């Protein structure tokens, strides 16, 4: 973390793009390159007991070099504020893109395929994302799909073994939930109080994808959502799952989904 440079000279802060973990996030401009960046600003006075988790996510992101993981550019300390600079992805989150209407299975498969490419990278690197969900999947304006908002090392996407206090297979369960979310708009139990979901996930049979979806998609979900982690496939194996192979297409096609969200 750069303690000497002034981030307010280096970056032009623009509009908020939502509330993130531990701080507010803004669209911004790198004044030297004119590239758009995402800027998270954390008040270290207000968020004292969480600084350890902040440095941990900074460390993890700095160790990632993948087309499928949002790029980290650095961080700056100015007075009491920590500025964290990331790649700006103009397509929004996958969750955002659900809003105009349902995804088709080509769009679902393409997004899941790219998520799997990111999980394959992280797991090969002995990393766990820990918070796979549609809101943490970001798209570039060209349709590229990247992971963001790693979980710290809300219950709806959590694997049962995580709740009961796991390895990379936890990400595979969360991917199954995310698959349901991309198909249906929300994860299982989304109508229920989170404290109820905390005991339902360990006690109940795993969720299934309900509705008029293709059997390969239902089987993709079922394969991820096995209570037994060792019975879940790896990200590598799921990249060859028939649902992915028969339905995923070029990521550039997702610009149609991005454009639809702007006309909505
Ligand atoms: C809409 N386009 C877009 N493009 C890029 C980003 C990049 C980030 C982002 C993420 C994480 C960190 C970070 C790094 C280290 C430690 C910590 C943590 F300890 F504090 N955090 C820094 C940044 Cl800058 C971001 O919040 N958003 C908005 C976000 O998208 C996902 C949704 N779940 C909530 O809103 C983005 N949005």
Which residues have any ligand 1 atom within 6 Å of their CB?
17-18, 20-23, 25, 38-40, 42, 53-54, 57-58, 61, 70, 84, 86-89, 92-93, 135-136, 138, 148-149
> Distance (Å, rounded) from C-alpha 181 to C-alpha 82?
33
Looking at beta carbons, which pairs linking 22-31 to residues 24 or more positions away fall under 8 Å? 22/47, 22/50, 22/53, 22/54, 23/47, 23/82, 23/84, 27/88, 28/85, 28/88, 30/85
Flag whether 24 is marked binding.
yes
What angle, rounded to 10 degrees, do the helices at 105-124 and 169-184 form?
A: 160
Maximum CA extent, the chain: 57
Whether 40 contacts 11, CB under 8 Å: no
What angle, rounded to 10 degrees, do the helices at 105-124 and 215-224 form?
A: 30
Whether 26 contacts 38, CB under 8 Å: yes
* DSSP assignment of 210-250: -SS--HHHHHHHHHH--SSGGGSPPHHHHTT-HHHHHH---
Which among 95, 148, 157, 174 is the best mutation to test ligand 1's pocket, defined by most ligand atoms within 8 Å of the CB? 148
Record the resolution, in angstroms: 1.9
Experimental method: X-ray
Looking at the DSSP assignment, which residues form a beta bridge with residue 72?
Answer: 86
Q: Where are the domains of the chain?
A: 1-88, 89-264
> Distance (Å, rounded) from C-alpha 177 to C-alpha 235?
15
Q: Return the SS3 of 181.
A: helix
Residue with tokens 């795993």: 206
Q: How is residue 104 written in tokens?
A: 């088709």
């Amino acid at each position: 973390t750069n303690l000497k440079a002034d981030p307010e000279e280096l970056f032009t802060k623009l509009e908020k793009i939502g509330k993130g973990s531990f701080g507010e996030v803004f669209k911004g401009i790198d004044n030297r390159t004119q590239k758009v960046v995402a800027i998270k600003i954390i008040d270290l006075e207000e968020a004292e007991d969480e600084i350890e988790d902040i440095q941990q996510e900074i460390t993890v992101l700095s160790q990632c070099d993948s087309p499928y993981v949002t790029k980290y550019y650095g961080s700056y300390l100015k007075d009491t504020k920590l500025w964290i600079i990331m790649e700006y992805l103009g397509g929004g989150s996958a969750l955002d893109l659900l809003e105009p209407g349902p995804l088709d299975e080509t769009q679902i498969a393409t997004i899941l395929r790219e998520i799997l490419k990111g999980l394959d990278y992280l797991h090969s690197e002995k990393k766990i994302h820990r918070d796979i969900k549609a809101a943490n999947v970001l798209l570039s304006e060209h349709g590229e799909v990247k992971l963001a908002d790693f979980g710290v090392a809300t219950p709806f996407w959590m694997a049962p073994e995580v709740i009961k206090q796991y390895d990379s297979k936890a990400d595979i369960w969360s991917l199954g939930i995310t698959a349901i979310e991309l198909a249906r708009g929300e994860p299982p139990h989304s109508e229920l109080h989170p404290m109820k979901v905390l005991f339902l996930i360990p006690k109940n049979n795993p969720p299934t994808l309900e509705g008029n979806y293709s059997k390969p998609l239902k089987e993709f979900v079922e394969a991820c959502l096995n209570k037994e982690p060792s019975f879940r496939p790896t990200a590598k194996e799921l990249l060859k799952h028939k649902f992915i192979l028969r339905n995923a297409k070029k990521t550039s096609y997702l610009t149609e989904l991005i454009d639809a969200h702007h006309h909505h």
